[PDB]
Amino acid sequence: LCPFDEVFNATRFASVYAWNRKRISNCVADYSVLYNLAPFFTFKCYGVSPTKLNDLCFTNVYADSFVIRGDEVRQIAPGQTGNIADYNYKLPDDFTGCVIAWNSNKLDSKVSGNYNYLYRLFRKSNLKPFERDISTEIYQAGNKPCNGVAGFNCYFPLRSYSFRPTYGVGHQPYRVVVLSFELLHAPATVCGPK
Amino acid sequence: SLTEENAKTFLNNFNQEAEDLSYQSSLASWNYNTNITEENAQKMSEAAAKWSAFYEEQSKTAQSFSLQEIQTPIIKRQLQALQQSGSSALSADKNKQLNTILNTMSTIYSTGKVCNECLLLEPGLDEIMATSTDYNSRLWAWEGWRAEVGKQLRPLYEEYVVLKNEMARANNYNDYGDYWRGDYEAEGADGYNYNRNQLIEDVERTFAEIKPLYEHLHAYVRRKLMDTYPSYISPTGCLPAHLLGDMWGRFWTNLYPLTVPFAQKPNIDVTDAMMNQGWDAERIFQEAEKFFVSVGLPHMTQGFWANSMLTEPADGRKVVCHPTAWDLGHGDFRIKMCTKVTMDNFLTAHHEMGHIQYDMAYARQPFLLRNGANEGFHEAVGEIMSLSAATPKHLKSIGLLPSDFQEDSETEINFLLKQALTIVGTLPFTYMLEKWRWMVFRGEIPKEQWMKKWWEMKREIVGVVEPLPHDETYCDPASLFHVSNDYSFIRYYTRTIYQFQFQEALCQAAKYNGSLHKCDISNSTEAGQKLLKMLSLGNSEPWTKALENVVGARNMDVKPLLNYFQPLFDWLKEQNRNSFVGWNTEWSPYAD
Numbered sequence: 001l002c003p004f005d006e007v008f009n010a011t012r013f014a015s016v017y018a019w020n021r022k023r024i025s026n027c028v029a030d031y032s033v034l035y036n037l038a039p040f041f042t043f044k045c046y047g048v049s050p051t052k053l054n055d056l057c058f059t060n061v062y063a064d065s066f067v068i069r070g071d072e073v074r075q076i077a078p079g080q081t082g083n084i085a086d087y088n089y090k091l092p093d094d095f096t097g098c099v100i101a102w103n104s105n106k107l108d109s110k111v112s113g114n115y116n117y118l119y120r121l122f123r124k125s126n127l128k129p130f131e132r133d134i135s136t137e138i139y140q141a142g143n144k145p146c147n148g149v150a151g152f153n154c155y156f157p158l159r160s161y162s163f164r165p166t167y168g169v170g171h172q173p174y175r176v177v178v179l180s181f182e183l184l185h186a187p188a189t190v191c192g193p194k
Numbered sequence: 195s196l197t198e199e200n201a202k203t204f205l206n207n208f209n210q211e212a213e214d215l216s217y218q219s220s221l222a223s224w225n226y227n228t229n230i231t232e233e234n235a236q237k238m239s240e241a242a243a244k245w246s247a248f249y250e251e252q253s254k255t256a257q258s259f260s261l262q263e264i265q266t267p268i269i270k271r272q273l274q275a276l277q278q279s280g281s282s283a284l285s286a287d288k289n290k291q292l293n294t295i296l297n298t299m300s301t302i303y304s305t306g307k308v309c310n311e312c313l314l315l316e317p318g319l320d321e322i323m324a325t326s327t328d329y330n331s332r333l334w335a336w337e338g339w340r341a342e343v344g345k346q347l348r349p350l351y352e353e354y355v356v357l358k359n360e361m362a363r364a365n366n367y368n369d370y371g372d373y374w375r376g377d378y379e380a381e382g383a384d385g386y387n388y389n390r391n392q393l394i395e396d397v398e399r400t401f402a403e404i405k406p407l408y409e410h411l412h413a414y415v416r417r418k419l420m421d422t423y424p425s426y427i428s429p430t431g432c433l434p435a436h437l438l439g440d441m442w443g444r445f446w447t448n449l450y451p452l453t454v455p456f457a458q459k460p461n462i463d464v465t466d467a468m469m470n471q472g473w474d475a476e477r478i479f480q481e482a483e484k485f486f487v488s489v490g491l492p493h494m495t496q497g498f499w500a501n502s503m504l505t506e507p508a509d510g511r512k513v514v515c516h517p518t519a520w521d522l523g524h525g526d527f528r529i530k531m532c533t534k535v536t537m538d539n540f541l542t543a544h545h546e547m548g549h550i551q552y553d554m555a556y557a558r559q560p561f562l563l564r565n566g567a568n569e570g571f572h573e574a575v576g577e578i579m580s581l582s583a584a585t586p587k588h589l590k591s592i593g594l595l596p597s598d599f600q601e602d603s604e605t606e607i608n609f610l611l612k613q614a615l616t617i618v619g620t621l622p623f624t625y626m627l628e629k630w631r632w633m634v635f636r637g638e639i640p641k642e643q644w645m646k647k648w649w650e651m652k653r654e655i656v657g658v659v660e661p662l663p664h665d666e667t668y669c670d671p672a673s674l675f676h677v678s679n680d681y682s683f684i685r686y687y688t689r690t691i692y693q694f695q696f697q698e699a700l701c702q703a704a705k706y707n708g709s710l711h712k713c714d715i716s717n718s719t720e721a722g723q724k725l726l727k728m729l730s731l732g733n734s735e736p737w738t739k740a741l742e743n744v745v746g747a748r749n750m751d752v753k754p755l756l757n758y759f760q761p762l763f764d765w766l767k768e769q770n771r772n773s774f775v776g777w778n779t780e781w782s783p784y785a786d
């Protein structure tokens with residue numbers, strides 16, 4: 001069967017600025033197990049419905065896992081705008097798949113702050129659909145050259161998420177999983193059980 | 195219009211860093227207040243030093259951007275609030291002397307003692323000034339406190355005034371009094387501008403309409419004190435300062451047991467019925483949340499219920515035991531209060547929940563704009579809720595008062611009289627103190643005429659006379675906490691005005707058909723939506739627009755205040771018809 005146990009139950013999810021991607025090629029899939037926890041505020045499907053996922057078959061499915069703030073989960077959708085949508089992870093205007101996310105305060109939060117998750121704050125231009133930029137050069141905002149030293153009008157692009165147990169409810173960590181059901185004029189492989 | 199994206203990015207980064215730094219500092223301060231230990235104190239001091247350094251460094255760079263070149267209103271507002279340095283304008287030695295004098299005056303005040311008997315300020319002396327009813331007992335205390343504190347603080351205040359003036363002049367301000375007035379300054383379109391010099395005109399015009407009600411209350415209280423101070427009260431003179439039930443005469447609440455309108459019909463106190471029903475700490479906050487939901491405001495987060503300290507800890511932890519609504523940022527709201535089973539505790543819990551709701555309102559605004567429109571809206575937003583919760587009908591519906599209870603006319607008069615003694619009594623005092631402080635900073639009252647003009651104003655505006663002659667060596671103003679410590683005092687007048695303004699504005703939205711003092715905004719979503727229309731703005735828009743969003747008017751108006759005490763006003767007019775309204779300024783007890 002498909003290795004769904006590795007996408008969701010990973011001991012540590014990737015940062016939004018370095019979201020990882022996994023694909024399915026041969027084995028069977030099963031969508032009825034995507035129940036990480038009872039309240040699933042993020043189960044939005046695009047182009048398809050959750051009830052017919054089993055009957056439909058696709059060539060390959062891309063699963064992108066990343067963590068973002070609760071307030072930024074709404075930005076993971078086609079046609080949205082925001083620091084996460086433009087500079088970290090952009091979805092096409094006409095995208096077919098499923099967006100899944102759940103609360104992860106107990107895991108990705110610590111009293112002293114879990115600075116292991118980061119995000120891109122500034123970028124010279126918006127990211128294209130399904131683009132991943134991991135550069136670390138300084139962001140030049142003025143008419144002066146960024147000589148590798150941070151300061152006035154020369155800020156560091158990446159910043160850290162200070163997840164804490166009492167970090168409110170909107171700023172808490174949310175393990176996101178975006179499933180892209182790519183289908184083309186190719187042999188379909190990702191079918192449902194029979 | 196050029197060089198704006200740079201300021202935008204600067205503000206973005208500043209917010210990104212300042213939110214986390216403020217969360218850390220607030221969490222340290224919370225851990226210290228809820229657990230007083232040297233370790234928590236050191237952590238709080240280090241966090242505060244880090245936050246202060248970061249904010250000062252970011253503000254020094256904020257001044258590099260010429261504000262007049264920015265065109266976006268929100269970015270301009272964000273830059274304006276951060277460009278103001280304040281104390282950093284002074285040199286190293288000037289700040290040296292300023293901080294030295296300030297903290298030395300604070301220590302002389304806190305560590306002040308009177309010796310004839312010997313009682314400290316908070317314990318003993320305040321209890322005397324509140325409960326004591328003997329002439330000499332209060333006279334010796336009121337004289338000794340001043341002669342011991344103000345005489346020592348006088349030589350320090352003469353330097354502190356000029357130091358603060360130099361500080362303000364470096365910030366392009368005229369005087370320190372003008373610096374404090376900057377809190378009400380507003381910028382915007384033609385119909386939303388508010389000149390900084392116009393605050394005095396509004397305060398004076400607003401006070402001219404409160405004098406009749408205050409004059410009648412004074413005439414009433416004066417006669418009621420003759421039964422306890424026969425030879426120390428005059429039928430046409432001013433009231434002695436030491437007989438105001440307070441060390442400074444700020445609050446007349448301590449005079450209610452003597453000036454009660456009707457003694458045979460007391461006020462309401464649901465403490466007995468509250469405790470008999472098993473009302474614990476959380477039960478009160480549950481009712482407060484239910485009330486705040488009945489108006490259409492958001493619910494309380496589970497984080498608040500989990501992190502808030504709503505009961506005195508029995509683990510032996512040392513707590514400051516003072517009510518304060520905490521907004522640690524990032525959605526971490528908490529309430530700190532040693533909740534007990536009483537009605538005063540109920541009202542304070544309602545006030546703190548209103549503060550928390552207000553803080554939650556403008557959480558969507560930028561970090562630099564997550565503050566109230568002015569220093570008067572904050573306390574008023576909670577005072578209006580406390581007033582709405584004190585309605586007898588609300589207590590009857592909640593289940594504390596029996597449904598068979600029928601409100602009476604005398605109880606309402608007593609409640610209004612107590613409110614006036616606690617509200618109407620402090621309005622002239624605050625205005626007089628603020629005007630005196632302004633005239634001192636502006637240099638209109640020479641140092642050789644401080645006490646003379648101070649007492650002349652006390653006699654004219656407030657109608658209070660001193661029991662003994664005070665020369666220029668005494669410093670009665672510095673004897674007050676808010677005068678020794680640098681704290682603006684006009685906030686209370688504006689708060690008292692804005693709370694009644696909001697009460698009269700929301701009652702119209704709730705479609706009330708009765709007296710304003712019995713208005714209950716509960717179970718009225720239109721009232722909350724109209725109020726939330728302003729709480730969400732915070733400091734994003736000028737306070738004029740924030741006030742218009744609720745009251746409809748763009749400036750202060752005391753008509754709702756007079757409407758609130760309209761029954762008490764007529765009652766006093768009918769009762770004060772047995773005396774000469776007013777007071778003479780040429781009479782003094784030391785005229786032996």
Ligand SMILES: *[C@@H]1O[C@H](CO)[C@@H](O[C@@H]2O[C@H](CO)[C@@H](O)[C@H](O)[C@H]2NC(C)=O)[C@H](O)[C@H]1NC(C)=O
Pocket residue numbers: 225229230231233
């Ligand atoms: C209240 O104050 C005490 C003062 O001792 C704190 O106790 C110390 O906490 C550090 C870190 O928690 C420990 O490494 C020490 O061993 C503690 N000493 C004791 C007596 O255990 C305590 O943490 C503070 N507590 C609360 C509840 O804030």
Ligand SMILES: *[C@@H]1O[C@H](CO)[C@@H](O)[C@H](O)[C@H]1NC(C)=O
Pocket residue numbers: 004005008009033034035036
């Ligand atoms: C992860 O493992 C748990 C069992 O501990 C399982 O219930 C859950 O469904 C797995 N994750 C997914 C979505 O496959």
Ligand SMILES: *[C@@H]1O[C@H](CO)[C@@H](O)[C@H](O)[C@H]1NC(C)=O
Pocket residue numbers: 488587588591714716717
């Ligand atoms: C508020 O609404 C509830 C539910 O209708 C009702 O039980 C209660 O009597 C109302 N109370 C007031 C203050 O009108």
Ligand SMILES: [Zn+2]
Pocket residue numbers: 517518
């Ligand atoms: Zn308070």
